[PDB]
Ligand binder design. Structure first.
Ligand code: HEM
Ligand code: HEM
Ligand code: HEM
Ligand code: HEM
Ligand SMILES: *Cc1c(O)cccc1OCc1cccnc1-c1ccnn1C(C)C
Lengths: 146, 141, 146, 141
């Protein structure tokens, strides 16, 4: 579903306050902790044996930053998520064969992290707008399966 | 399947909810209805308006049911048979909707109890809610 | 969906042998029995209270025939499933709001019914070709969500 | 959560499998590998050619585990703890793959035991395989 203009302003305003060094790493780390099979795609990343080990892993933090940047690209091109994520879709679908349900999971983990950081500022209407974003992103990332 | 550590996390985290149970249950429902509008089709007999007394009251029922589920965490099928009757036999709720409410519950807990919502507790709560969801959507009588 | 020449010949040959009066109704019936929440979408169909009631229900059988006919249309137009199922997708997605996981489930129940009817003739390569087909149909029905 | 009727259906159906359990396990694996080639990524060290003795041997192991699950249907977490360690802790198998194997097992049973594969039994068997899947993909120890 399309974001409304009010929703687009709300998501963008909140996103400007996000800690870009950290939030991506927390989302990726939580994915690896909450859904541990996703660790299979990151065997070269080192120690992922405990929650602390995952969250404090420099490669998880670094790679999370990249994940966050891609979400930032989506927020700047919401009318063209297909185009924006075309390359990433090929990598994740054609090369890595990540099951698409996992893209949905990461999206929702990111939403949980935003709630964690922003508290009562992450209002139900604000969440609803972000659910549209993460759904659009997941869908764009799974495009090669469509 | 919850580990012993999972059960300690859920007991601890949900125990910190306390008198805010209905508040959080209501908020999770509101979050679900706004974020995933198709879920509203299960509640045509409810006043779903924002700040509805019926939603606040139902949030309390949902939250109180979870407390019952945590209290009988090793015998959830028996403990929650009436609710399985309701959700699986009567209402025939598509399991996707349970994933949606569970997610909204985690969002609510993360926003309100950020110190408690560690990666490990997040994991355990997600498993607990999935477990409750499986029981409520299964026909086992 | 892309099938090799031998896959196309294999799926077509089997499909010609399908009992068009029964196979659709057994697939839809089994969906309603195995995944009972799907009954919510069929309140107007009457008695669905037991497996025998579902399988013997005249409306389940009749509707099953229509479902089977859609799969036949899809088989005829494998190169353009998105176009073929455009109006059906609008119905299932925009009007009925059927969660798309259920599309995958019905495709796999159909495959179970084909196995049930054809036995050892439903070989692993034949199944593989049909899994490509039902995945394509499920994806096409879900296109309005993409 | 299996009903008493579900457990009777599973046990009745698995009884008719008999000495063919390994054959069916092998066929389900083969059907999985051909229909869902991404699943082969979990077995890079296996001979996966058609007729592979290794796949036949593995089909027997899988079938034997399911037999053990049938014997311990009310005690699956305890009975299957080593297999959970393997699949959940060590292999980290994505749960979607269990849905694929479970589906291929149903396809195999429908192909071989059509008189046994009633809609009721199909439903019970699907639930049983989902239950086993949940145990093998959870870390609870
Ligand atoms: C849902 C939103 C997701 C976004 C926005 C995203 C974004 C990205 C980006 C930007 C890269 C870097 C590619 C490059 O530098 O060329 C990447 C790599 C990767 N992603 Fe994702 N990703 C997502 C989901 C997933 C999921 C769910 C998994 C696995 C379960 C996954 C596994 C990977 C892997 C394995 C790599 C390559 C890591 C490496 O090079 O060692 N991603 N992703
Ligand atoms: C953790 C998940 C859930 C819990 C713990 C839960 C708990 C409950 C409880 C305690 C009731 C009250 C039953 C009574 O009247 O005594 C109830 C009712 C209801 N629930 Fe849920 N529920 C959950 C998920 C869902 C979901 C996902 C839906 C739909 C999307 C749903 C739809 C309903 C409906 C329609 C009622 C109507 C009760 C009435 O007739 O007034 N529930 N639920
Ligand atoms: C996956 C492949 C599926 C195919 C090929 C298919 C095909 C069809 C067709 C041809 C119709 C008739 C529409 C018309 O007359 O214009 C229809 C109607 C319908 N389908 Fe499906 N369908 C599928 C999946 C599903 C699923 C999974 C559900 C529900 C869980 C569903 C629920 C319905 C309902 C409720 C109707 C309308 C019945 C009525 O008029 O009362 N379908 N479908
Ligand atoms: C009902 C589902 C399943 C059952 C009952 C099952 C059972 C087993 C058993 C009994 C073993 C042998 C343990 C031993 O060596 O003593 C095993 C190994 C294994 N399973 Fe599964 N399994 C299931 C599903 C899966 C799925 C879905 C995958 C991957 C897609 C998978 C991948 C493996 C792998 C890779 C091994 C190790 C093979 C080796 O190195 O020898 N299993 N499984
Ligand atoms: C009962 C069930 C159904 O219907 C589908 C999938 C999984 C199911 O149970 C999993 C299972 C099996 C054995 C022991 N515990 C569990 C489990 C895992 C999470 N919740 N549960 C229930 C408390 C049984």
């Amino acid at each position: 579903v399309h974001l409304t203009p009010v929703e687009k302003s709300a998501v963008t305003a909140l996103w400007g306050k996000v800690n870009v060094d950290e939030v991506g790493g927390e989302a990726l780390g939580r994915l690896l902790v909450v859904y541990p099979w996703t660790q299979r795609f990151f065997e070269s990343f080192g120690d992922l044996s405990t929650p602390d080990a995952v969250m404090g892993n420099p490669k998880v933090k670094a790679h999370g930053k990249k994940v966050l940047g891609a979400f930032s690209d989506g927020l700047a091109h919401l009318d063209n998520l297909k185009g924006t994520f075309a390359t990433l879709s090929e990598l994740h679908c054609d090369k890595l064969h990540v099951d698409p349900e996992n893209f949905r999971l990461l999206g929702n983990v990111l939403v949980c992290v935003l709630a964690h950081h922003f508290g009562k500022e992450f209002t139900p209407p604000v969440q609803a707008a972000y659910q549209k974003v993460v759904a659009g992103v997941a869908n764009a990332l799974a495009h090669k399966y469509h | 399947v919850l580990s012993p550590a999972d059960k300690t996390n859920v007991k601890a985290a949900w125990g910190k909810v306390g008198a805010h149970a209905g508040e959080y249950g209501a908020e999770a429902l509101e979050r679900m209805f706004l974020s995933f509008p198709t879920t509203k089709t299960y509640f045509p007999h409810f006043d779903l308006s924002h700040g509805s007394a019926q939603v606040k009251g139902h949030g309390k029922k949902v939250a109180d049911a979870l407390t019952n589920a945590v209290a009988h965490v090793d015998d959830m099928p028996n403990a929650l048979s009436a609710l399985s009757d309701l959700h699986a036999h009567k209402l025939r709720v598509d399991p996707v909707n349970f994933k949606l409410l569970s997610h909204c519950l985690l969002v609510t807990l993360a926003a309100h109890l950020p110190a408690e919502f560690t990666p490990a507790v997040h994991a355990s709560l997600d498993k607990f809610l999935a477990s409750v969801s499986t029981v409520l959507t299964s026909k086992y009588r």
